[PDB]
Amino acid sequence: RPRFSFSIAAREGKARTGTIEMKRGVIRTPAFMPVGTAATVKALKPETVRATGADIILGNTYHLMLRPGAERIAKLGGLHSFMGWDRPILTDSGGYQVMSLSSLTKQSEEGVTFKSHLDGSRHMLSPERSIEIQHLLGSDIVMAFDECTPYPATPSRAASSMERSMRWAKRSRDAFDSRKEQAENAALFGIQQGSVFENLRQQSADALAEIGFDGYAVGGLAVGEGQDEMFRVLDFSVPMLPDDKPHYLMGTGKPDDIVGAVERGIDMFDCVLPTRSGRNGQAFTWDGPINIRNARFSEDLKPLDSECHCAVCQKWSRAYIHHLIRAGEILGAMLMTEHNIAFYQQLMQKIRDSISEGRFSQFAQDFRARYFA
Amino acid sequence: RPRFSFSIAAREGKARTGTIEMKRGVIRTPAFMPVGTAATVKALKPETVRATGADIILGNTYHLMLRPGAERIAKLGGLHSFMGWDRPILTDSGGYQVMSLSSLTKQSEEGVTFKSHLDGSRHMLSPERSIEIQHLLGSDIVMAFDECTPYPATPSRAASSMERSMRWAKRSRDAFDSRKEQAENAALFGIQQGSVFENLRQQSADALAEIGFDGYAVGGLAVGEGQDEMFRVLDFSVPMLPDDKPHYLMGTGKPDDIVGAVERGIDMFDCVLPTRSGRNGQAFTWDGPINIRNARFSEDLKPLDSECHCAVCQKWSRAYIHHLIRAGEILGAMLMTEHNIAFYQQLMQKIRDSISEGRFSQFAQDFRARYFA
Ligand SMILES: [Zn+2]
Ligand SMILES: [Zn+2]
């Protein structure tokens, strides 16, 4: 396999289905990436993650650099070897979690210094250091390091952060390119910024395309603007990106967000929702989410979802999982997480098949009618 | 298969190896039973429990009667169906955990009333109610309900509690026998009491043999007396029990306790040690236990144990598991528990093979020399 090759097999409107070929494997798109925070997809062995249908997982650079440490992971043979996942891994840049989780952050044009939320140890991130950490982890898809824009944001602030992000995108590009092993074996994605402003989104897309990346994320969404606004921004933003590269919507999300984003040209997604909310009792079904902790499930012998092909739904009842979650049992988290990630992968498979067959519009309508009945 | 058939295939001194055949499966002895507290062996799917080599698991009646409830489990089809383990299950009587975990306990010749440690709801146990709850769960090996003797105990108190336990053993026998489905499909074990006193142990053995049970536990040990004393009591106590039935040492335990107890005629064991201590970082190895949290393991690429055949030791390093446990990750508990239970099953297999081959004395010596080096 090549370092990176994205091929589009079929289209319907703005929606696309295809494959990304990389050295460690093929990624079917549209793709959902389970999130591995600190070198584990929570409560699942890698073989179970694979069995659900995942082609690629995400690793969080911020968490990994704090624990167990990037240099340590490199010494031990890289993230794939460390955690036992041999397929592609996309790593985020670490920048967002610096903003959301760390303290004492000092920002500058050079990068950011911050104190760990774990022990108050001091750390630094910059375009160069983020790219280096992702190299040490042995990431297959490396994300450019950017500066996030909060919601809401004034036009001036959105412009300033977008402009800094574009300068940092060029720095990320050059850092990546200057490291032979990384440049020859991994891919680099840029991140479009500009908040909800069309002109800024256009300037950002232009800057990123001029630099040139293997893929393009739409950043700065799913941060409080709500679905209508997110979709409005996607409507004009995605067409600005190069058509022939993957489009990645960061930080989303809910099944309906995924379907609508695919309708608008997005190819890749990640979110903690199926893992995190699973551990909290939320199970996805084709008739909408349920909270398994609810008393109504205490004697319900049906599986979590009536159609789901996952191993959990073949073997255990709602009643049993209700008990496990209410009791705080680890097996509860294991079963909920496996089911939710399997559900997400089945959603992506239905999306891919429907686009391939030219019936994705009908699928989206049918999906919504039932999910929100 | 029959309701119950214990066959001894080989002996060496007081040690025995053989099989218990029951309707749901065959149990190889000496046997280690992983503990399922609230209808789950913590952090493991039943298929993983089976893959380690377990033939039978233990369920805790006290916990199950509180959550999710015995009647509820019966309504849902019984414990095997509920949790997805189709092989034999031994249930304890609930009495010990009433003493150790519950509050506001009122004891009488009839039984005990107590408040749940979970929500202060009021509950009752008696020989009759314990046997009934074990029936509702669908237990394969039912334990007689007894009255525990603390350590240390005066001769008078030890005698009184032993005598009550024997009266309760007869009540347990009659309750079990009066329920056709239970009598025809399950087995009933009696529990020898008498603290550290030879005459009381003899009286207890005599009473239990007169009533007649399918198996005999040595109760009242591993409660603070220490290994030397426990072994001293086993030395005279086990020969008092019927030779042709299984002998079960409750609440133990450490690998060296198991080996010495087998040397003294014990056939069955359970303990939370491999599961509980695993989640806390303790991993068993042939060179003794280690605590995986220790800094010395942070960059150790070796598996938990150099010889262990378990899936964990085939795939992941000490360094990775060290990270998971220190990070509080669920996968850490999963991997530690699988390894520890697999280690215990490999210990039992080595014990069975060595007795079968007439070299168990040598095995015990070699095991100790290395484990305590
Ligand atoms: Zn499922
Ligand atoms: Zn192992």
UniProtKB/Swiss-Prot annotation, chains A, B:
Binds 1 zinc ion per subunit. GO terms for cellular component: cytosol. It is an enzyme of class 2 (transferase). InterPro entries: ArchSynthase1/Queuine_TRR, TGT, TGT-like_sf, tRNA_ribo_trans-like. Pfam families: TGT. Residues 251-257, 275-279 are annotated as: RNA binding. It catalyses: 7-aminomethyl-7-carbaguanine + guanosine(34) in tRNA = 7-aminomethyl-7-carbaguanosine(34) in tRNA + guanine. Zn(2+) binds at C308, C310, C313, H339. Changing D270N: Abolishes catalytic activity. Its cofactor is Zn(2+). The active site is at D92, D270. One of its GO terms (biological process) is queuosine biosynthetic process. Changing D146A: Abolishes catalytic activity. Catalyzes the base-exchange of a guanine (G) residue with the queuine precursor 7-aminomethyl-7-deazaguanine (PreQ1) at position 34 (anticodon wobble position) in tRNAs with GU(N) anticodons (tRNA-Asp, -Asn, -His and -Tyr). Catalysis occurs through a double-displacement mechanism. The nucleophile active site attacks the C1' of nucleotide 34 to detach the guanine base from the RNA, forming a covalent enzyme-RNA intermediate. The proton acceptor active site deprotonates the incoming PreQ1, allowing a nucleophilic attack on the C1' of the ribose to form the product. Belongs to the queuine tRNA-ribosyltransferase family. PANTHER family: QUEUINE TRNA-RIBOSYLTRANSFERASE (PTHR46499:SF1). This is Queuine tRNA-ribosyltransferase. It comes from Zymomonas mobilis subsp. mobilis (strain ATCC 31821 / ZM4 / CP4).
